[PDB]
Amino acid sequence: STRPLTLSHGSLEHVLLVPTASFFIASQLQEQFNKILPEPTEGFAADDEPTTPAELVGKFLGYVSSLVEPGQFDQVLNLCLTEFENCYLEGNDIHALAAKLLQENDTTLVKTKELIKNYITARIMAKRPFDKKSNSALFRAVGEGNAQLVAIFGGQGNTDDYFEELRDLYQTYHVLVGDLIKFSAETLSELIRTTLDAEKVFTQGL
After folding, report:
1. Most exposed residue of 35, 82, 97, 147, measured as fewest CB within 10 angstroms of its CB?
2. Which chain positions lie within coiled-coil regions?
3. Beta bridge partners of 136
4. Which residues contact 143 (CB under 8 A, 6 or more apart)?
């Protein structure tokens, strides 16, 4: 027993087979989701505006995840996340789907990043961590000895605006690297405090 709940923004649409038990919750969530969503434009150029059904389902996932606290919307979050995985991931990873959207479809980089953020955020709010060993081709090749992997870490001079990379990491992968970023800032502040004259070097703090 399921029912089709249609969530859409202009021409793009996607229908969810929600169980009748929580369809009412899902429907009020759809209502509020559209109450927050901006109006369709011609071509989907505005920011915070989906361009593909994948992007819209991702944004719905992000909104529902923002509502769930680590529980009433947890089941609907799990259901729509499962629908997204079944339909758009094709048993592939979120970044593969993102690259496909960027290349084939008329998707921009910020829309790709926020779609990825919404998917991962939904995964961690739905009690669905990435604790399963990924079957990525490169690492399967490494495991069977076909490929050899060397990590190289960059340094200075690569870019004049390295901080936007840290920023985009903190936004796109907030729930993932949030502990790392908070820890790094904590020990950096502690080192500044315990260093003799570090504050002089850090005029605007750290």
Report:
1. 35
2. none
3. none
4. none
Label residue 61 exposed, middle or buried (CB < 10 Å: 0-12, 13-18, 19+). Answer: buried
Resolution of the coordinates, Å: 2.6
Strand partners, 12: 9
Alpha carbons 188 and 153: distance in angstroms, whole number: 21
CA distance 113 to 206: 26
Distance CA 109, CA 115 (A): 10
| H/E element, 152 | none
Instruction: Indicate the Cα dihedral angle 197, 198, 200, 204, nearest 10°.
Output: -160
- Cα angle 116, 117, 122; round to 5: 100
Q: Name the one residue in this structure whose structure tokens are 């961590």.
A: 129
Where are the strands (E) in the chain, listed by range? 2-9, 12-19
Cβ atoms of residues 67 and 73 within 8 Å: yes
Per the CB < 8 A criterion, the answer to whether 127 and 92 are in contact is no
For 33, the token pair is 């989701």
- Using left for φ > 0, alpha for ψ between -120 and 50, and beta otherwise, residue 3 falls in beta
Neighbouring-strand partners of residue 8: 13
- Give, to the nearest 10 degrees, the angle between helix 23-36 and helix 53-67: 110
